Symmetry: C2
Subunit: 436 residues, 2 copies
């Protein structure tokens, strides 16, 4: 992101703040994987949003004096020749003001000696309480020094307000620079999904297909997935977060792959389901066709002024009609709709926000997701049907899990589909898989 | 591992324990990556060593009545249809006695209502204090219930003893079944390194070579690396834990790759350094030959009765002589050795234990690693030289980072090299890369 993008975001947050206030935003702690080995570092999304700085042990403070004056202070790791030979290069205090466009930079290891002085006699501090223990302890120890420091003329701000609601509502609306990154994440994720369809063969293991996907992400500079990849063959595709990926892929089964890269801090999220052996059986194609009808209806409908709730009603109708046709449900369509009889087979939401997190921040309005869509929102569109191996249905449909998922951007006139470059028509899938 | 292997390990720990005691071994917590997404779960090594069970929220209790009577209890997650449709299959309580060879299994969420009853009237509890907050919490709440329950005729064990010294000394000596796993980890890791040499070209990014290696691991059923891969081209090879892997590989630089798979819970750990363009420059070759003479000599020397300390002494002499002969150091050999003049260029250990962790558990004896070696010990052999870009040395050597690392098992008379199947001779490297 450009300097101006990050400064715009900081200034937008500052605009919400009161005079005589400071917002404090913390980096993610490091995560142990085992003993002294750590997982590859993933910076806190909100901290990244404001800085693009991917070091741990860093804290940004935005201090608002009045409506025309504010300044910033960063705490971050010191330059140190020895830790740097060992553990890698660090930004340090000297370079940080110009690199990160902050006014002052201080060593993180002095944070407890310095932060309280920064917050002294402010009115409000903005902090994300409960997010990280280490951050809470720092902020709370600072406030207690101030409460106990009357003799030193110290005073604690009396109010602590969460900045998450404000910053998350910002993150809900993507800028052009963010859309461009999400476009590329979607294209990388699509290329990976095409590759999996091209490489899949009976006898391969689910984890071998995951390996194809992850290798594709890495070629294009997305080293890490945005979430643990699901490669669910046969009955495994009926488990929504199946990530064991430990089974042989069987001739005659479908495989459901839900995979998306993290590309410069933004997520793709694609699901495609396809026959392991390259030919849908009749029962597979029939369930597939309902899911495809659902996604295509959804893609036609998503636009400014509708909502996830409203498009979901149209999907449910399609599902109920189709399930009655297959004998999976029985009875009157409207009654079955009122009874939400699709729920044993479609048990999750149609769409979630997408962004720096795969389940992105932002207010859906309520648990039914009636928020009115507007340009710049980015969301998934992910209908599915999962018919358990022991479902009380005609036996030919048992053990079929299908989901089809694309990522879209709401535009002025409708939506842009960022992931349509990997096929979803079942004949197209079969043709693609026949080339190989 | 076979059921018998886990039994052998459990009985070996029980053999150390006092009559009237229980050992408590906890699973790892899950690790957040971002917001509601988690990193791929990594079981705690010691818990895995005793169980092979890869679920969080699991606790093993080994209770010793006397020298001929013991029993076990597992706490683990319950079977739950809905959480399992969403999040994956769980073992549950009914299946656990057979699957994990425990006498009894109880729900994890009842642990605080159950554990104190298991520890009542024992004399000693074995617990790894400080390892995990959640575990300390559970154990110490159980103890407090017992201390405060004299009205219910409860009694707390008066002694808490760490089992880590014992269990880590067990892990230091590998069984046949473990060596056979480490062999395959070494082989998979070597195949990946060979592939990196075959694929490397100028203009490829460091992360792209990493992608090659990780794909190879996954092909063979090692989904995850044992640690974050280092691909350090040019000056990046001089940073020991360089994992940014973000630079173009340049014509005329070496690249240092340190990578190893995690295969069925055990780590490989190989380092190879090679020219990006397939031909060592004279200075690259001269430095490389010092490191190669160091690893070759170490491989001849490691055997029962010596120590990492003692072999390291020989390595240092090789290095100092080598560096003096090139003009990189200046002075008398023994003087320089006594002055530890090699340290700016070789600043880490020659060897670390290897097992379920890359930096495996086990007592080194002293900071200089004088532990006398015995059959069954598994260790790396990893000399290196790292000539800083601003080093005060003849300038053709600046910016060269070379490490060569194999994994060995100490045997009755010497050692077996698990990773010699990837080349290290510099002419074998050039020939291999020329074929490509
Ligand atoms: Mg999704
Ligand atoms: Mg998805
Ligand atoms: Mg290594
Ligand atoms: Mg090593």
């Amino acid at each position: 992101m450009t300097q101006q993008e990050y400064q715009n975001r900081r200034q937008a947050l500052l605009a919400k703040m009161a005079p005589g206030s400071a917002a404090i935003i913390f980096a993610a702690p490091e995560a142990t994987r085992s003993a002294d080995s750590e997982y590859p570092y993933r910076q806190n999304s909100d901290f990244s949003y404001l800085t693009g700085f991917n070091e741990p042990e860093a804290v940004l403070i935005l201090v608002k004096s009045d409506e025309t004056h504010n300044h910033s202070v960063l705490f971050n790791r010191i330059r140190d020749l020895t830790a740097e030979i060992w553990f890698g290069r660090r930004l340090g205090q000297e370079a940080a003001p110009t690199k990160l466009a902050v006014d002052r930079a201080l060593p993180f290891d002095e944070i407890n000696e310095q932060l309280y002085l920064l917050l002294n006699r402010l009115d409000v501090i903005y902090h994300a309480q409960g997010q990280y223990a280490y951050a809470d302890n720092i902020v709370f120890a600072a406030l207690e020094k101030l409460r106990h420091g009357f003799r030193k003329n110290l005073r604690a701000p009396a109010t602590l307000t969460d900045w998450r609601p404000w910053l998350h509502e910002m993150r809900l609306f993507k800028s052009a620079e963010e859309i461009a990154v999400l476009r590329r994440a979607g294209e990388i994720s699509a290329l990976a999904h095409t590759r999996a369809m091209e490489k899949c063969r009976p006898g391969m293991f689910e984890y071998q297909l995951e390996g194809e996907i992850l290798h594709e992400f890495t070629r294009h500079g997305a080293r890490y997935p945005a979430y643990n990849t699901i490669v669910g063959g046969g009955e495994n595709g009926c488990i929504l977060h199946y990530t064991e990926n430990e089974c042989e892929l069987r001739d005659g089964d479908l495989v459901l792959i839900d995979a998306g890269c993290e590309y410069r801090g933004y997520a793709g999220d694609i699901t495609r389901t396809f026959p392991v052996n390259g030919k849908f059986t009749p029962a597979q194609r029939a369930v597939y066709d309902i899911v495809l009808a659902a996604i295509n209806k959804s893609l036609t409908l998503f636009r400014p002024g509708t909502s996830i709730r409203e498009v979901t009603e149209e999907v449910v109708r399609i599902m109920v009609v189709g399930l009655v046709e297959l004998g999976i449900l029985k009875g009157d369509i409207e009654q079955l709709i009122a009874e939400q009889a699709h729920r044993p087979f479609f048990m999750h939401g149609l769409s979630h926000w997408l962004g720096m997190d795969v389940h992105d921040v932002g207010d859906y309005g309520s648990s039914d997701r009636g928020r009115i869509l507007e340009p710049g929102m980015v969301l998934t569109v992910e209908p599915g049907l999962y018919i358990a191996p022991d479902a009380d249905v005609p036996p030919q449909y048992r053990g079929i899990g299908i989901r089809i998922e694309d990522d879209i951007v709401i535009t002025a006139t409708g939506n842009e589909n960022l992931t349509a470059s990997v096929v979803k028509d079942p004949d197209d899938i079969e043709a693609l898989m026949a080339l190989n």
